[PDB]
Amino acid sequence: SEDCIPKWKGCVNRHGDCCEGLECWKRRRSFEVCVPKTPKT
């Protein structure tokens, strides 16, 4: 019941709509999808 895009749901037109800790990523083999943000090393 939250307002945000889950992990790998599709962000072809919703980049800044991914849940907290997520980030829209474009792909060449598949359509853009909200991918999980990686840690900082």
* CATH, residue 19: 6.20.10.10
User: Please, what is the Cα angle at 36 between 32 and 37, to 5 degrees?
Assistant: 110
Paired residues of 10 in beta bridges: none
Which of 39, 33, 31 has its CA nearest to residue 19?
33
Structure tokens at 14: 């919703």
- Residue 2 region by backbone torsions, left for phi larger than 0, else alpha for psi between -120 and 50, else beta: beta
Q: Who contacts 10 (Cβ-Cβ below 8 Å, separation ≥6)?
A: 31, 32, 33, 34
Q: What secondary structure letter does DSSP report for 27?
A: -
Q: What technique was this entry resolved by?
A: NMR
Say whether 19 sits in a helix, a strand or coil: coil
Q: What are phi and psi of 22, to 5 degrees?
A: -115, 165
Q: How far apart are CA 5 and CA 1, in angstroms?
A: 11
Is the four-CA dihedral 14, 3, 34, 19 of positive or negative sign? positive
Expressed as residue numbers, the domain containing 32 is 9-36
